[PDB]
Amino acid sequence: GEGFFKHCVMEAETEILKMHFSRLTEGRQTYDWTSERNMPAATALQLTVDAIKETEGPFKGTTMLEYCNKMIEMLDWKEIKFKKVKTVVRKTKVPVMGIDSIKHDEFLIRALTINTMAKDGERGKLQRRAIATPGMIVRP
Amino acid sequence: NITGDNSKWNECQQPEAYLALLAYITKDSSDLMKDLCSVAPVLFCNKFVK
Amino acid sequence: MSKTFAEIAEAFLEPEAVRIAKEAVEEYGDHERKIIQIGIHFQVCCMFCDEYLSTNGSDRFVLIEGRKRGTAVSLQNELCKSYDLEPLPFLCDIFDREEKQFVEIGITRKADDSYFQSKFGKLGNSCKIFVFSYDGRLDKNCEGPMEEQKLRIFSFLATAADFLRKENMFNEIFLPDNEETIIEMKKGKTFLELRDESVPLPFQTYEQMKDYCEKFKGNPRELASKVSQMQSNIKLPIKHYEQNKFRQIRLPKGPMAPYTHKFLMEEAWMFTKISDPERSRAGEILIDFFKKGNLSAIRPKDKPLQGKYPIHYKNLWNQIKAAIADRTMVINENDHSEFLGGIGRASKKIPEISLTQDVITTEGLKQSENKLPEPRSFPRWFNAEWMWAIKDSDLTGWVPMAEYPPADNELEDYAEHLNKTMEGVLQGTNCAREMGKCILTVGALMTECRLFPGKIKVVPIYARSKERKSMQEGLPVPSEMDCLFGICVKSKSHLNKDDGMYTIITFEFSIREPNLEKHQKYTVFEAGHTTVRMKKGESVIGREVPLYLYCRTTALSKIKNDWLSKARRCFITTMDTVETICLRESAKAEENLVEKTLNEKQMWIGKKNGELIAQPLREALRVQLVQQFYFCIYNDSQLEGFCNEQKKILMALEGDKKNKSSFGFNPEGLLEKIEECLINNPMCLFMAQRLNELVIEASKRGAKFFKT
Amino acid sequence: IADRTMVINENDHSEFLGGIGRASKKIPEISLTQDVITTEGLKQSENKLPEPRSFPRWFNAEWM
Amino acid sequence: EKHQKYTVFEAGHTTVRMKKGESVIGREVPLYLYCRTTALSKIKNDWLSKARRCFITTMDTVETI
Amino acid sequence: AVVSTHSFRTRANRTLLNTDMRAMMAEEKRYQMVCDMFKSVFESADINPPIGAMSIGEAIEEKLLERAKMKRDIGAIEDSEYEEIKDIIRDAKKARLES
Amino acid sequence: MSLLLTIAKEYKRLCQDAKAAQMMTVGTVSNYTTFKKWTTSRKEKNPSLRMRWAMSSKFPIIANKRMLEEAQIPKEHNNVALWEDTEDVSKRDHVLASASCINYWNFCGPCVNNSEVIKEVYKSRFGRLERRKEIMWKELRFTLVDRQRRRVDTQPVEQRLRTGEIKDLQMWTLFEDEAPLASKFILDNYGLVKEMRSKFANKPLNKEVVAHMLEKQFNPESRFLPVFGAIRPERMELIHALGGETWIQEANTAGISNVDQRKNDIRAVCRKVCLAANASIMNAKSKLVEYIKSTSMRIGETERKLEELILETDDVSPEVTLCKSALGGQLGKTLSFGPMLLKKISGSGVKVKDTVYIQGVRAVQFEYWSEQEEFYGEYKSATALFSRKERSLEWITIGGGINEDRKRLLAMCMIFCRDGDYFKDAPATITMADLSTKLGREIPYQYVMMNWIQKSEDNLEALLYSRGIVETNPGKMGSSMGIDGSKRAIKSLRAVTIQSGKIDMPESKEKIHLELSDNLEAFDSSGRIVATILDLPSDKKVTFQDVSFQHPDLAVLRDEKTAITKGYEALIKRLGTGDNDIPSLIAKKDYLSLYNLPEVKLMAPLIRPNRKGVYSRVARKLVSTQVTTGHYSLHELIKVLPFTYFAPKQGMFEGRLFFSNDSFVEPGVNNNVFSWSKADSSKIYCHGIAIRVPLVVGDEHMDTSLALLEGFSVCENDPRAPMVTRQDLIDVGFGQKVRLFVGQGSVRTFKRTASQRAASSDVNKNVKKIK
Ligand SMILES: [Mg+2]
Ligand SMILES: [Mg+2]
């Protein structure tokens, strides 16, 4: 064809512009940067969107495009608030939920951060080739 | 015929070349979704590895 | 799912009504999705107009929206001719000949006021302006359309709204002058900077890379680029006959490889007990009923042969015997703490915060080091182990196998018969014995990890078997029983967030003198004397034979507990490999050769007296079953590297079989990867050496290979 | 019946005919001796007899 | 019991009516479709094809009396 | 899949509940009783994804009013009990508005 | 009673929590679909092994409480503890219990008479068993070449439909309370709605289950599968027991569902319709769409329109492509040329025009293609692979089974190839094949010589010999193709080799649609000539249980019968809109206005004059005695009504048979003129069918009196109209704006309406006007 890329990109634009961002929860494990741990994509996305809600207010986007717009808008945010459980010694340590703050400098690095997974279920190698699980802002 | 298998297939490929290629594919498509195509590679062009 | 916009539009809309959206969308403005928006509006007009003809051949309304722009201009000047009304600058949708006035129709998602103030701001009272919401909200100019068209257009807008909700397209369909202007992708200064320094080329600003991309036209200069790249890449022409040696296969040198199986096979000894259904149903009480026999009397001497930790194991044995009397849990809290972890010690951890001073003042001799496994050499005993697992044991079968399903003549006769024969052959083998004991005992441990976490329990090592008699008197009964290989001990089963591995202490009976070379991990004792007798046509008294007690400690991962708990899988992987051979042959002759192929077809099995030996496919089936069972038992990362890099050797070999002149590019590197994955694994090194012999005999048959 | 009273199905009648009678493939005796030496296909010989019934009731109503 | 060889269906409904001195409407009655398969020998085709013979064997037996 | 009588749900371990992960899950449970509530009100919620432009609470309230009118008009339930349900609905609308 | 109360109180508690209150308020209801996705994401790593660890414990299982206490004793027989009052692990209203109790209630439980309810829910599965009952068996062995990739319906079921519409059926049959009012599917396809909703709606058991199983009941799974050459979708269900690489089985094709032949009947229907559009070339675009939307198909158990069958049918025939092209259905990845089917796997190029000579010393333009292009040919019992370059075949290989079919493949693909020898043979082509006689239309040339080859037997031998013939070299012995289609390889054609085996079929998931040219040509994808004009010239008319309408150009319509049937259609169709129509009169109980109706005066002259009054007396009697509600049959009123107009005389003679121009219409007693259908709304007048949806309260329609009652539409939300449940909607009369809860929570308002009209034609006529 002469229109190969134009047409394939047309199909992609169609399917993505339709897409609710909730289907972003479908997939492998991804890196939740709130607690800085690896999580199933659904819970990690719940923490990301919930943090956006507690910082700037609830997210009404309901589309992949508006989710991406909010992602790129957060990079200019000078302050971000998290749901982070902090242990308080009451001497018994009760891990009381808390609200944490972060600065654009740290948040950018946390957004570009990828995490390592020591390989499991791989067949046929003596030495392990580890697999990476990128963050939630990079995924869409 | 030959059976080929590639080693370090991921370490050799680079998101910069993917940024150029994605810019080539989105040339005529739309300027609205092209800026949305170029954003994916640049997050792997500057990326942090734990 | 819908892959294209024309699909979405033509799905819920009228087929020809979409074509006007596509055509108008091609030229006057350039947006791909927005067809759907006007796909609503356009159709919203049509049902409006056709409905009324005013008492004349001429229609009541005329439609200027769907037409072409330049034509719509002049056709709007026609109205200045007919009714002499002011020539409005904004081109409206529809003109009424009954009301003789301008008509335009908006459609908005939000509350009607938001848009109606916009369009009313545009055209004022000069036109009849009707603004509908999909939800049933209504905004209008002075007078509304007739009662029928209201109802129809509102029903349509409602249904279309429900379709859009089902496909979840909402904010994108918003009115042009409100939301269409912001169709752009949000550009943050952080992202624009990141993108501007992310570009590969000597160009910095993203715009220059964008220009070189969009404007790119490649010339045919990649032929010289590819030939200069070829000159830079000097190497990798490849010829089989040049490297056909493959330097045979490299093999490690050192001490002989030990016995890595969690249990002993060839030298293991059995204790027979005829089983009660209600007594043996527990399977934990099996040893409690065993102890009422002669098992309780056996005790080892303090001085072992070839023991590493004699007194510990002896004390633990006495704790097992004492426990079995009361209950099968061992109560020693101090004893297990040292044995656990594979004599692994719990190492105290000092925080880094207080450690800095200990770096300034170095004490405790602070360093960091890791350790590697020591390589071993090709095992001898392994061959004897295979030859023992190959022959049929006196007991009939060790593996629980369910009943056969009902049969129809065509297939299930063939399938049921093949399964009856293969099962009948493989149940009698000693390999089936080790399979059965593995399933039963590792299942027992698997239950014990849920039953008593963090507790010490005595688990038997047993296998169930019913005895066969083919002499074929009708007889009293065939003997149904279960036999005991030895006793086993489990430590703490606690499960870490990372992987935990349980520790296990195995005690097995044996009639056989230990061999220091392969048993180095085992601690052997002189246990006692065991009575063994037979009855034959000869006198066959049998005397008594000394009994040795083998002890060791091993690690079991929960994953290993599972995959070793189901050993039955091996049968299937044998079955397929066997069954195919019988079909591929018979399918050639279009006849039933299965029974004939099993007995007649000869498979090369082993070598004796320097002569290649072959056995029929039914008895050589045991070789495949043993091979798969060893694959299950002996599986290490080393083994998987070995096989996954070995398939290349096999494919090159069959490449030289049919004389296809096969080649592989850096055989030194391939043999370095095969060498790299051979360390301590007995099965790995064994299949390596056997591969050497395969290369030798194949090179003798015809030479695409080398012999030293 | 709409077009013409012949049914065109060549596969359908083959199973129904013979009274659901199946066409049984015949193996010659000359090649059969080996199959006696090696018994396959479960070779046997048997014949069948009709199952007896009991006095009908409905017959009287049929006569009447 | 007697139809064991027959395969019966539920075919439909058939209309049946009469005219008498009474009202006799008749409404409708369900229609069943009986199916079966049988064997016909050519000899049976012939001897069953001529059933008129029965009359004669009755006639004689009657007429003699 | 055949449902028969034999299909059941498996209990999760006590692992994630002991660590702080539960202290984070306190939000997910708050989603839980919500989704379970809406599924009790709307039976096809899981099968057909809910649509229309309305709030979850608004649809729940008006639907509860419709079922209350249904059971009161023809079926058997008391009128004063209907008005009690209406009272609970409006009293719920108060606390819903305050947020 | 407290089941609603405790839900209301639960809502009170939930909205009292502000964190849950705001997330309940903000946004659409669609957020539920996201909210549910935020839970129970954790799954165990081990599929079986974790389950073994689960069943190891004696009381692992979560089970309900109330039902067990209601039916059966919680305590055991053997004194092994069963029940406790403690809820442990996850906290939910279910209390934990042992596994064996399930077995106990399966043993001694008190349940009766569930048998009939089960099967027709799972009739997909139960039927897939029923089919295995009747088959016979034979076993052998061979080295079998299966056809590797066919995308073919597996698990086929009658009345198969698309996923969206079957979701609509799901919503309507599961529950009425929350459902959208969905026009397109419910209006046209009603009567399957009546059946499914009728059987599943009355006994509220396993709502979710029955739903998700009915989703799979109507959904044939078309996967990419190896087949050994029996392509009927019934054999696809169980292939494994039947065939494989070494497998063989016999006595199958006989037993099949009624769908397999019905599809072919639809192919013949599209044949006749496309012929009707072929008769008049004034316009082919506007007529064929009429012939489509007018025709009504009768599926064995259900009446369904031809539009929704054509658009949504799975199998794409050369005809079916033409019938879809008139509509907006997108079905691509299909090439149709004559009887042959083709798929394009490679290359591209532009259509060019080249004028080349015939033997009659005359020049005619030929449109050819210059591309290097690799396509897959498909013909009856034969498959092959061809590649053409610059208007001549480059590479060819034949995988066909039968020799004749191989020759046909070779021929047809040579026709599509269009070599130079294509021009050299012209034995009397011009006299007939040159000019097709349809309003003086010149028929395209590829199809011209295609038809010349379809003509006689020697015409095949002509072009078969037109290819180069050479004695093939050793090593091509098995691949060589004789003139008659054999492998003897003494003499063989050039640039062709047979393969021993079949040839795999490509597949692509793609949708492409474009408008059709006036000659029944589809230029879709800006070229590609996929419509192949007329595939086969069968001149035959045979139909069984099929409906046509609107000047079909086939004459089934007598004068007297069109007088009777059209006279009925005036009454049936024109009534139901508003006051002074049948529904308002029936609601008023006044049947006198119903007698005097002006549409009855149209029917009056057609009755037999002799008994006219004698008929009218019994007719008026029947209509009057049904005025009492609940006793009236709404079809019998239409059947009986037209005879009431004349002054009743006391006949005393029976009026059962009503002669209308010497044809009788009896009460009940469905006949040629009047067919009275049971348990669904329709009726048949000879070869055609009509029905009126909006108002039918006829007593047998109880299951959908909520669905059928709708002739309404949406107007405005302004009045405060009492919120009426769907069962309360039957009471509100005409012109009454009322407020109603719709679907998933969006609430709108309606009145009694003239139904939506001219969904298509309203746009089509204006689009034609603007040109
Ligand atoms: Mg306009
Ligand atoms: Mg406008």
Curated annotation (Swiss-Prot), chain A:
Instruction: Describe PTMs of this protein.
Output: Phosphorylated by host PRKCA.
Compartments annotated for it: namely: Host nucleus; Host cytoplasm
Chain span(s) of sequence motif Nuclear localization signal = 93-106
Q: Which cysteines are joined by disulfide bonds?
A: none
Superkingdom classification of source? Viruses
Q: What does this protein do?
A: RNA-dependent RNA polymerase which is responsible for replication and transcription of virus RNA segments. The transcription of viral mRNAs occurs by a unique mechanism called cap-snatching. 5' methylated caps of cellular mRNAs are cleaved after 10-13 nucleotides by PA. In turn, these short capped RNAs are used as primers by PB1 for transcription of viral mRNAs. During virus replication, PB1 initiates RNA synthesis and copy vRNA into complementary RNA (cRNA) which in turn serves as a template for the production of more vRNAs.
How does this chain assemble? Influenza RNA polymerase is composed of three subunits: PB1, PB2 and PA. Interacts (via N-terminus) with PA (via C-terminus). Interacts (via C-terminus) with PB2 (via N-terminus); this interaction is essential for transcription initiation.
Q: Which family does it belong to?
A: Belongs to the influenza viruses polymerase PB1 family.
Q: What is this protein called?
A: RNA-directed RNA polymerase catalytic subunit
Taxonomic source organism? Influenza C virus (strain C/Johannesburg/1/1966)
- State the taxonomy lineage: Viruses, Riboviria, Orthornavirae, Negarnaviricota, Polyploviricotina
Q: Which gene encodes it?
A: PB1
From Swiss-Prot, chain D:
Where's it found, cell-wise? Host cytoplasm; Host nucleus
Known post-translational modifications? Answer: Phosphorylated on serines and threonines by host kinases, including human casein kinase II.
Q: Which domain of life is it from?
A: Viruses
The stretch of residues making up the signal peptide is none
What family does this chain come from, according to its entry?
Belongs to the influenza viruses PA family.
Quaternary form? Influenza RNA polymerase is composed of three subunits: PB1, PB2 and PA. Interacts (via C-terminus) with PB1 (via N-terminus).
Its job:
Plays an essential role in viral RNA transcription and replication by forming the heterotrimeric polymerase complex together with PB1 and PB2 subunits. The complex transcribes viral mRNAs by using a unique mechanism called cap-snatching. It consists in the hijacking and cleavage of host capped pre-mRNAs. These short capped RNAs are then used as primers for viral mRNAs. The PB2 subunit is responsible for the binding of the 5' cap of cellular pre-mRNAs which are subsequently cleaved after 10-13 nucleotides by the PA subunit that carries the endonuclease activity.
Protein's name in the database: Polymerase acidic protein
Say which species the protein is native to: Influenza C virus (strain C/Johannesburg/1/1966)
Q: What is the lineage of its organism?
A: Viruses, Riboviria, Orthornavirae, Negarnaviricota, Polyploviricotina
Span within the full-length protein is 324 to 387 of 709
UniProtKB/Swiss-Prot annotation, chain G:
Its quaternary organisation is:
Influenza RNA polymerase is composed of three subunits: PB1, PB2 and PA. Interacts (via N-terminus) with PB1 (via C-terminus). Interacts with nucleoprotein NP (via N-terminus). Interacts with host ANP32A (via C-terminus); this interaction promotes viral RNA synthesis.
Protein name according to UniProt: Polymerase basic protein 2
Supply the InterPro entries for this chain: Flu_PB2_2nd (IPR049110), Flu_PB2_6th (IPR049114), Flu_PB2_C (IPR049115), Flu_PB2_CAP-bd (IPR048298), Flu_PB2_middle (IPR049111), Flu_PB2_N (IPR049106), INV_PB2 (IPR001591), PB2_helical (IPR049113)
Per the record, the GO terms for biological process are:
7-methylguanosine mRNA capping; cap snatching; DNA-templated transcription; symbiont-mediated suppression of host gene expression; symbiont-mediated suppression of host mRNA transcription via inhibition of RNA polymerase II activity; viral RNA genome replication
For whether the record's keyword set contains NAD, the answer is no
Q: One MF term in GO for this entry? A: RNA-directed RNA polymerase activity
Where does it live in the cell? Virion; Host nucleus
Tell me which stretches of the chain form a coiled coil.
none
What are the UniProt keywords, alphabetically? Cap snatching, Eukaryotic host gene expression shutoff by virus, Eukaryotic host transcription shutoff by virus, Host gene expression shutoff by virus, Host nucleus, Host-virus interaction, Inhibition of host RNA polymerase II by virus, mRNA capping, mRNA processing, Viral transcription, Virion
Tell me its family: Belongs to the influenza viruses PB2 family.
Record function comment: Plays an essential role in transcription initiation and cap-stealing mechanism, in which cellular capped pre-mRNAs are used to generate primers for viral transcription. Recognizes and binds a wide range of cap structures of target pre-RNAs which are subsequently cleaved after 10-13 nucleotides by the viral protein PA. Plays a role in the initiation of the viral genome replication and modulates the activity of the ribonucleoprotein (RNP) complex.
Q: Which GO terms describe its cellular component?
A: host cell nucleus; virion component
